Each structure stands twice: as C-alpha cells, then as structure tokens.
Amino acid sequence: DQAGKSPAGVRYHGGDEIILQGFHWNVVREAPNDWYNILRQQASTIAADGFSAIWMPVPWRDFSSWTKSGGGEGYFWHDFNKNGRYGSDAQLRQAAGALGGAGVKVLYDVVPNHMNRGYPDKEINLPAGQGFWRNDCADPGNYPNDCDDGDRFIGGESDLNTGHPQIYGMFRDELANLRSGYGAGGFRFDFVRGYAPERVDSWMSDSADSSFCVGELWKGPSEYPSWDWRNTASWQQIIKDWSDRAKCPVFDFALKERMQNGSVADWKHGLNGNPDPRWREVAVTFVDNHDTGYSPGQNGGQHHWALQDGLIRQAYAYILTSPGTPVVYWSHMYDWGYGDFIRQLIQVRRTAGVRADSAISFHSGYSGLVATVSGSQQTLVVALNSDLANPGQVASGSFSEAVNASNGQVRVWRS
Ligand SMILES: C[C@H]1O[C@H](O[C@H]2[C@H](O)[C@@H](O)[C@@H](O[C@H]3[C@H](O)[C@@H](O)[C@H](O)O[C@@H]3CO)O[C@@H]2CO)[C@H](O)[C@@H](O)[C@@H]1N[C@H]1C=C(CO)[C@@H](O[C@H]2O[C@H](CO)[C@@H](O[C@H]3O[C@H](C)[C@@H](N[C@H]4C=C(CO)[C@@H](O)[C@H](O)[C@H]4O)[C@H](O)[C@H]3O)[C@H](O)[C@H]2O)[C@H](O)[C@H]1O
Ligand SMILES: [Ca+2]
Ligand SMILES: [Ca+2]
Known part of the structure; x- marks a missing residue:
C-alpha cells in the first residue's frame, strides 16, 4: 500500500485504498456486544479478500433508544468511553490490532456534530450558557447560527458548537486517542454538512495529517437557499467544494444519485467519472451504506435509498473497475452472497493497477x-x-x- 496526499493536498492515502464498510445498521441488535470479537476473528479473511482498509462503527458508546425503532448504533453517543454496544474497550483494541496486523487500516466513524446531551450517566457534561451548544444562540432554522457554523441535526438541541475552542480541542484530542491506543489509520466524518469543512482539515492536520479521511456530505442542491450558488449546482460540484475545503475525500453521492434515479448509461456523471483527475480522485464510491441500504434484521434496516438487486453486480463492477476510491458494504460482501463476485473484481482492480486518479x-x-x-x-x-x-x-x-x-x-x- 502506498501513502501520500493528492497533488492538491487531499488525504486520499496514495489513491490505492479499497475499503470495507465494516458493519451494517442492525449489528448492535444482531450480534449483541460481540461485533469487535467478530471483526477480530474475520480480520485475516478481510485482508485475504483484498481490502486495504475497514470503516469501523462509531467507537463512542451510544445507549440511546427511540420508537420503527432504533438506537445504540453510535450516531447518538453520550461520551467517548469505548465500552458500548459493539464490544468492550479491550475487544476494540484486540480487533484494531488484528486488522492492522493483517494490513487493514482502521478508519473510525466519528460524529462531531452532536451528542446525546440528555443522557443521564456520562463522562462529558457541558452546561448551557457558555457557548458550547448550538442552542446557546438564537436558532431560527436549519442553517448556520452564531454557535454552529453548519446545519443542525433535526431540531438542533443536541448540536455542539464545534468551533468553540474547548469543543474543537475535545475532538482533536479524541482523534489523537483513536490514532494511538485504537490504531486508527484515518476517519470517516459523519454529517459534514453540520460544521465547517475547514474544521475537518484542521482536525486532520492536528491529529492525523497523513492518514486517510472521508467526509459524508449527503445534501442535494434543493436543500440550499435559493441565493446560494449550490442551489443551482450539480451534486458533483457540491461534494467537490466540500473536499477542496476539508482536504479530504468525499463520498460520491453524485454517483449514488445517478444509480438511483438515472440509467446505467448515466452512471458516468458521478464525481468518479469526471475528466479532471483532481475531481475524480477525491470521490469515495459506494453502492449502499448503513443508511441507504438494507441490513439484516429488524425492519430490513433503514433502506433510505437502496439499490435494487438487479443492479448490484453492475454497480460493484463499476465502482471496483473505475477511478475514485471504492467502498464495499458489509452485507453485500458477507451476508448476501456477492463476496465471490466482489473478490474477483478486487483482484481485477489490483492486477490492472487502477487507482483513484486513473x-x-x-x-x-x-x-x-x-x-x-x-x-x-x-x-x-x-x-x-x-x-x-x-x-x-x-x-x-x-x-x-x-x-x-x-x-x-x-x-x-x-x-
Ligand atoms: C441519515 C442521513 O440524513 C441526512 O441525509 C438525508 C439527505 O440530506 C436527503 O437529501 C435525503 O436523501 C435522499 C433520500 O434518502 C432518498 O430517499 C430520496 O429519494 O432522495 C434524497 C436525495 O435527494 O435523505 C437523507 C436521509 O434522511 C444527512 O444529511 C446525512 O448526513 C445522514 N447520515 C449520517 C448522520 C446521522 C446522524 O449522526 C446518522 O443517523 C442515524 O443515527 C441517528 C441517531 O441515532 C438516527 O436518529 C434517531 O435518533 C435521534 C436521536 C432522533 N433525534 C432526536 C434528537 C434531537 C436533537 O436534540 C431532536 O431534535 C429530535 O426531535 C429527536 O427525535 C431521531 O429522530 C431518530 O431518527 C437517524 O435516524 C439515523 O439515520 C447516519 O447513520 C449517518 O450516516
Ligand atoms: Ca494507501
Ligand atoms: Ca451543527
């Protein structure tokens, strides 16, 4: 595996990553308190299958619950303690060690936008009235305010002021912790619409400058105000702008939108198909994730925007043979029987020497x-x-x- 930033300083770790999304939405329910153990046991298989990296679930414990029903998956964490619903701190260290020992870099999902502010038993207790929270300032709608330079999660009452120096530093230090005892090789940033892209650049510069990163910006043109240039922009332009400012690769939701709404011929209009190598090489392509796709278990997972089964093989063949950096969804690979097909395509990609800028x-x-x-x-x-x-x-x-x-x-x- 080769390291290195892109010519523009974007943290694509050499352009040669092939990533496994290492969970599905219902893992905490389907394998209670056992997922890190499973990943430890599967580390040698994941490496043999040709993955260079694994996107791990959020490692910060989450004991939230809501009613469809859900909770505990990591996106409403209450502190950084690692003893959550995927396994213990010790089990996480064992899994990260096994994955790294097998040559699979460990990418943690991190969630800076918000936390479970109301959870009664937690290590992080930030009072009101000091600027730590979005709603310490007037909050007239879902857009930046004086305590939050990005969008808000639902009503915004749990959004953190990530630009406050204490909060910035809290996340900076936890990223450093993850890179140390938890063996992180990079990070997947959640809900990047929620805070400034430049803050991701700063966090990576401070705590993991040569690591891989990817941001999740899932926001269409019509979600921006009519006077914002993005309101009339393409999906590609929106995600590319985020990548420019974060100096991080970005999930190719332009490609995903074409896979859902366009024809197969139109898949060429994802970010990863762009004729400018500085555009396509920052795309992180995928077929489905834990939000868009099905998952085993209750309610079939979330399935917000799932690719129909008559296009799954085509979509994997496209992402695994093309530029950008591809991500394989756990359940396609290890639950639903596409593994042999995907293994073959990974070998084709490697043997041909295809990289994110090809x-x-x-x-x-x-x-x-x-x-x-x-x-x-x-x-x-x-x-x-x-x-x-x-x-x-x-x-x-x-x-x-x-x-x-x-x-x-x-x-x-x-x-
Ligand atoms: C799930 C995704 O939603 C957003 O994407 C939108 C996209 O912008 C839109 O265009 C649209 O895209 C597609 C759409 O999917 C497709 O069908 C359509 O045809 O085309 C659209 C594109 O044009 O829909 C997407 C999904 O809703 C975002 O942009 C994206 O970043 C996010 N993915 C990440 C973010 C989160 C949050 O950390 C995670 O959410 C997950 O974790 C959250 C936290 O546990 C889950 O939230 C739950 O728990 C919360 C605590 C709870 N909120 C409470 C908190 C508060 C606050 O005090 C109160 O205000 C509330 O009233 C209260 O109820 C939620 O109600 C409940 O649902 C969420 O459901 C789940 O998806 C995802 O797994 C992660 O990958
Ligand atoms: Ca690399
Ligand atoms: Ca926010």
Missing part, C-alpha cells in the same frame, strides 16, 4: 455503459447492461476476458 473514457454508440479505464498495468474495458459485442469495437490492443456475469450484463476485459 483515466476513464466513456464510449458512445452502445446501450448501457461502456468505459475504458487506464490502470498502471492494464487497460480495462467495462460493459454494463450493454449491447457491446467485444472490446475491439471500442479499444486498441489485445484483450482477454476478466469478468462475465449476469448473462453478459457485467463484462470486463483486460489488456
């Missing part, structure tokens, strides 16, 4: 999506839901078949 060209004249990808070692031809007959119709050189699945709806050839 060139990708899209070809006209066929149905579906037809792309040529320039890896450092091989050129790939990728044909998804297409009437393309063979790679010589669209590329020079000698090719052999690498993938042929779903009655030819997924085909990949390599030079």
Whole structure:
C-alpha cells in the first residue's frame, strides 16, 4: 500500500485504498456486544479478500433508544468511553490490532456534530450558557447560527458548537486517542454538512495529517437557499467544494444519485467519472451504506435509498473497475452472497493497477455503459447492461476476458 496526499493536498492515502464498510445498521441488535470479537476473528479473511482498509462503527458508546425503532448504533453517543454496544474497550483494541496486523487500516466513524446531551450517566457534561451548544444562540432554522457554523441535526438541541475552542480541542484530542491506543489509520466524518469543512482539515492536520479521511456530505442542491450558488449546482460540484475545503475525500453521492434515479448509461456523471483527475480522485464510491441500504434484521434496516438487486453486480463492477476510491458494504460482501463476485473484481482492480486518479473514457454508440479505464498495468474495458459485442469495437490492443456475469450484463476485459 502506498501513502501520500493528492497533488492538491487531499488525504486520499496514495489513491490505492479499497475499503470495507465494516458493519451494517442492525449489528448492535444482531450480534449483541460481540461485533469487535467478530471483526477480530474475520480480520485475516478481510485482508485475504483484498481490502486495504475497514470503516469501523462509531467507537463512542451510544445507549440511546427511540420508537420503527432504533438506537445504540453510535450516531447518538453520550461520551467517548469505548465500552458500548459493539464490544468492550479491550475487544476494540484486540480487533484494531488484528486488522492492522493483517494490513487493514482502521478508519473510525466519528460524529462531531452532536451528542446525546440528555443522557443521564456520562463522562462529558457541558452546561448551557457558555457557548458550547448550538442552542446557546438564537436558532431560527436549519442553517448556520452564531454557535454552529453548519446545519443542525433535526431540531438542533443536541448540536455542539464545534468551533468553540474547548469543543474543537475535545475532538482533536479524541482523534489523537483513536490514532494511538485504537490504531486508527484515518476517519470517516459523519454529517459534514453540520460544521465547517475547514474544521475537518484542521482536525486532520492536528491529529492525523497523513492518514486517510472521508467526509459524508449527503445534501442535494434543493436543500440550499435559493441565493446560494449550490442551489443551482450539480451534486458533483457540491461534494467537490466540500473536499477542496476539508482536504479530504468525499463520498460520491453524485454517483449514488445517478444509480438511483438515472440509467446505467448515466452512471458516468458521478464525481468518479469526471475528466479532471483532481475531481475524480477525491470521490469515495459506494453502492449502499448503513443508511441507504438494507441490513439484516429488524425492519430490513433503514433502506433510505437502496439499490435494487438487479443492479448490484453492475454497480460493484463499476465502482471496483473505475477511478475514485471504492467502498464495499458489509452485507453485500458477507451476508448476501456477492463476496465471490466482489473478490474477483478486487483482484481485477489490483492486477490492472487502477487507482483513484486513473483515466476513464466513456464510449458512445452502445446501450448501457461502456468505459475504458487506464490502470498502471492494464487497460480495462467495462460493459454494463450493454449491447457491446467485444472490446475491439471500442479499444486498441489485445484483450482477454476478466469478468462475465449476469448473462453478459457485467463484462470486463483486460489488456
Ligand atoms: C441519515 C442521513 O440524513 C441526512 O441525509 C438525508 C439527505 O440530506 C436527503 O437529501 C435525503 O436523501 C435522499 C433520500 O434518502 C432518498 O430517499 C430520496 O429519494 O432522495 C434524497 C436525495 O435527494 O435523505 C437523507 C436521509 O434522511 C444527512 O444529511 C446525512 O448526513 C445522514 N447520515 C449520517 C448522520 C446521522 C446522524 O449522526 C446518522 O443517523 C442515524 O443515527 C441517528 C441517531 O441515532 C438516527 O436518529 C434517531 O435518533 C435521534 C436521536 C432522533 N433525534 C432526536 C434528537 C434531537 C436533537 O436534540 C431532536 O431534535 C429530535 O426531535 C429527536 O427525535 C431521531 O429522530 C431518530 O431518527 C437517524 O435516524 C439515523 O439515520 C447516519 O447513520 C449517518 O450516516
Ligand atoms: Ca494507501
Ligand atoms: Ca451543527
């Protein structure tokens, strides 16, 4: 694995990451107090499957509960104590050690925007009236106020003033803690619409400057005020701007929006397809996550924006053969039987030398999506839901078949 920032200083850790999302939404219910144990036991398999990194659940304990029903998953944590619903502090250290020992960098989900302010038994107790909270200031709506330079979570009563020096420092120090005893190789920042992107740059500079990061900005143009340039911008432009200011890769919700609403041909309009390498190399691509996708267990998980099963193989073939940095969802890989297919695609990606900045060209004249990808070692031809007959119709050189699945709806050839 190679380290390094992008030419623009963006923390894509060499551009060669292949990431596993290491949980689904219902883990705390399906494997009570046992997930870190499971990850420890699976560390060698995860490495053998070809992942360079794993996105871990939020490590800060969360004993919240609401009624659909949920709670405890990490996104309404009450303090930084690691003895939460995924396992104990000791078990987390064992899992992170096993994953790192196997060559899988450990990326923690971190949630700076808010905390479970009302939880009665916690280590972090911030009073009102000192500027620590969004609602220490007038709060007329879901947009920045004088105590919170980003959006708010629901009603905002639990949003922290992350720009207050004490609160900034609290998170800075906890990121350093995670990088030390918990072996962090980077971070996934939750709800990045909730606080300034420049604060993510600062936190990473202070506590993990050479690590990998990714921000979750899931916010469409119509969610911005009519006078904001983003209101008339593309999904790509919105997430790219965040990445520029955080100096962090960003989840490719532009690609996800095309996968949900467009045709397969239109998947070329994700951030990861952009002809400018400074744009596509900051995209972190995915098929589904714990919010968008199903999960095993109660209510099928959240399934806010799930990709239908007739496109899952196509979507994994696209993200695993293309630029940007791909993320594989736990349940596709290890619950629902796509593992062998995904393993094969990961090997294709590695053997071809595809990285986040590899060139990708899209070809006209066929149905579906037809792309040529320039890896450092091989050129790939990728044909998804297409009437393309063979790679010589669209590329020079000698090719052999690498993938042929779903009655030819997924085909990949390599030079
Ligand atoms: C879940 C995601 O929501 C938002 O994305 C929106 C997106 O902006 C919108 O365009 C839309 O996108 C898609 C949409 O999915 C698709 O169907 C549609 O066709 O197209 C849309 C795009 O155009 O919808 C997305 C999902 O709602 C955000 O932008 C995104 O960042 C977030 N994902 C991350 C954020 C959180 C929060 O940490 C996590 O949420 C998770 O953890 C939260 C905390 O436990 C869960 O919240 C629960 O617990 C809270 C304490 C509770 N809130 C209490 C607290 C307070 C405060 O004192 C009170 O004001 C409330 O009244 C009270 O009830 C919630 O009601 C309850 O639902 C949340 O449901 C869950 O998703 C996710 O797992 C993480 O990945
Ligand atoms: Ca790397
Ligand atoms: Ca906020």
